[PDB]
Every structure is written in C-alpha cells, then in structure tokens.
C-alpha cells in the first residue's frame, strides 16, 4: 500500500526510484536554468514553486496546500482546519539571523503543507533564506542523517539540536554547483532515496 | 558508527553496507542456510544478524554494550538485555497474537547496535512460516504505516498486527516473495540502490 501517483505505480520500490529520477532531474534543471534564483525567498509561494517544480510529473498534489491530515512517528503536522492561516503567519515570521531562520524553518516543518515531499522542498527553501540573509548555505554532507531526523523530531519542542547542526554545517560557497548537487543527494538520502546521483540528467 | 572497512562518508557507508549485507541476504536464502537455523530464539536472530553484517560490523550478531534511544523511546537497558532475551526465548508463538507480541518484545529489546529492523523482520518471517505456514508480502505494508505502527507497538500492537495480518501470504517457498521482501525491508531503512536478486 502506497501514495496515489500520476503514473499508476502499485510497487513501493518502483515509485521510490521513479520519483527520485523524475524529481532529481527537475532539481538539476531548477539550478542550471537559474529558475532557482527567480523564486520568492522565505514565503509559502516560493516553497509551493519549489515543490511543484520537483513533483509536477509524479504527483497531482505538487505545490498544493494538502486537504488531508498527515503525521510522522508520534507527531501530527498542522491540522487542515487551520493549515492556511498558520501558513499566512509563517510568511510574516522574521528571518534576520540564524536563530530566526531556524525558528521559521521549524514552523514550516510543523505546517508540513504538502501530502509528501515536505522535507526535500523545505531544505531547498531554507538554503535560499540562508543565502539571502547570511550569505551562507548548508553543506548537508556535514550533518549525519540520524542526527538530522532526530533533531527535527525534537524541533517542535526544542530547536537547539537542529540549530547547532545547521550552524556548524553553514558554508560561504553560495554559488557552488557541487555544494548544491551533493546537498540534493544528501537531502534525498535523508528521505530514503539512494538510487541516483543528481549529476546525471 | 565504526565499520571494519574504515568508511568515513555516510552516503558511501550506506551503499557499501547495502551491497555487502544484501549479497549476504541473497546467499542466506539461496544456500538454504536460512532454514538450517533456530526459529524464534535469540540464537537464530544473532545468526541472521551475523550473516548479514559480519563483513561490515565487528558487533555483528553481538548484543550491544551501549544504550539506545529512538525519539522519546528507550530500548531495553544494556544491564537487563541478557535477562530480557532469555524471557523472549520463552515467549509462545502458537498464533498471530503470540507471534506479533514476541516480535514487539524483541523490537523493545533491540539487542544490536544497528540492523535490528532488517535482521528481526527475517526472524519474524521464519516464525510465521513454521507456526502459521504464512510469510509477509512486505510490499502490502507501507513504509510509514509500518514505522508508525512499530513506534506505537509498545503501547498497543493493534496497528502492526493489522498490517502483518493483511499482508500474510501462503507462498512459503516463493523465492520472488522472499527477495521482494528483503528489498522492501532495506527500503524501510532507506537503502534503495540494489535489487537483492541481481547480486
Ligand atoms: N517525527 C517528526 N516530527 C517532526 N518533523 C519530522 C518528524 N520526522 C521527520 N520530520 C521532518 O519531515 C521531513 C520529511 O518530510 P515528509 O516526508 O513530507 O514527511 C524530514 O526531513 C524532517 O524534516
Ligand atoms: N521509536 C521507535 N520505537 C520502536 N521501534 C522503532 C522505533 N523507530 C524504529 N523502530 C524499529 O527499529 C527498526 C530499525 O532498527 P535499527 O535501525 O537497528 O534501530 C525499524 O525497522 C523498526 O522496527
Ligand atoms: Ca517522504
Ligand atoms: Ca547508482
Ligand atoms: Ca559476504
Ligand atoms: Ca567475509
Ligand atoms: Ca538503521
Ligand atoms: Ca540500482
Ligand atoms: Cl520528503
Ligand atoms: Cl535495520
């Protein structure tokens, strides 16, 4: 049993691998065409664009505010009954420093506005806030998978674990294709996608 | 995590760990060694774990010496592991309710540093096969439904029991069912590069 998709795939392994190829392919194009730099920074509109850009081919819900309730582990993400107003309040949150950018990122993860693909899209969106505001981007290879997922699970209660991780992984190489491309490979790895290397179209 | 091959990169250790242990999982089955071992004991679980990770981890098939936590859940304390595993061995396994309860306790014990999910799911299928003449068609269980049901299982095993019951197959000697199951088991832990049968 799995997520409804456009391509009518009924095998979990099959969907995981094809989603990874169509979406990482899109992620490569997003960076290379410079479409990435024309996107609105720190807003839901910007996140929505990143999400639709990646999952347009495989998912009907790509870039849309979900109409269903979702959860991971023992945590329920922002209920549909107030998800939209909660998103309007995230758009207004300041992003003037790391403590603020991390707090805003933690709230956007709680909102979790999409049916699936929240993690990957919100990590691209965060890197552009850090790029704009601190002239820093994350080197996702410096953060261990287990450490990241554990910090995010804790983040609705105390964001110090994820703050320390982002802080110690920040790099000044803001226009480096390798830092981005590797970060995409590490981002997908966090979500359990390990078949492709983004380098290849 | 420290490995035998001295791998420092996380992505590198992930695909090497997958290659090596999945090739071992294929050989475990194809040699028929899988059916030569003890069903429902820590001895059998320990054999399965050693068989999978003996090339990569020094701790393969060995009981952990450090305490572990997943979220706000603490697994069996290292000091009580020996006692807990002896009690699990004594747990009945006559029907699905008993088999699932045994599996749930074994997951709470989590006797190894790493690879509990993968080694215990193989162990579970062998208890199901011996006692019910059923095995799990793991594709019929969503990754996140499975993971959420496992995290819930110490409080209520209704969720995981429901997933296991609705995925039971009588294809006990089906190699394709076993192989697809290993690939899904590894995918549950985030390893999606290889197909076990292509090794
Ligand atoms: N239990 C949790 N509580 C809060 N955030 C979580 C939890 N588990 C995972 N996450 C976040 O959710 C992302 C996955 O996005 P998705 O697959 O759409 O749910 C991860 O990359 C984390 O940022
Ligand atoms: N919070 C949790 N509570 C109980 N069992 C869990 C939890 N998270 C994961 N698991 C189980 O742990 C396995 C992963 O094993 P390992 O990576 O060795 O710790 C999964 O396949 C689940 O069966
Ligand atoms: Ca996901
Ligand atoms: Ca490959
Ligand atoms: Ca070997
Ligand atoms: Ca060897
Ligand atoms: Ca693991
Ligand atoms: Ca492959
Ligand atoms: Cl995701
Ligand atoms: Cl595992």
Author numbering:
A (entry chain B): 7 to 207
B (entry chain A): 9 to 207
Can I see the authors' text?
The most frequent PTM reaction catalyzed by FIC enzymes is the addition of AMP using ATP as a cofactor, coined AMPylation or adenylylation.
Electron-rich density was observed next to AMP in the active site, ascribed to a calcium ion present in the crystallization solution to the exclusion of all other metal ions. The nucleophilic water molecule is readily identified as the missing ligand needed to complete the heptahedral coordination sphere of Ca2+ in the EfFIC-AMP-Ca2+ structure, where it would be precisely positioned for in-line nucleophilic attack. In the deAMPylation mechanism depicted in Fig. 5 (see also discussion in Supplementary Discussion and Supplementary Fig. 3), the conserved glutamate activates a water molecule for nucleophilic attack of the phosphorus of the AMP moiety of the AMPylated substrate, and the invariant histidine generates the free hydroxyl group in the protein residue by giving up a proton, as also proposed in ref.
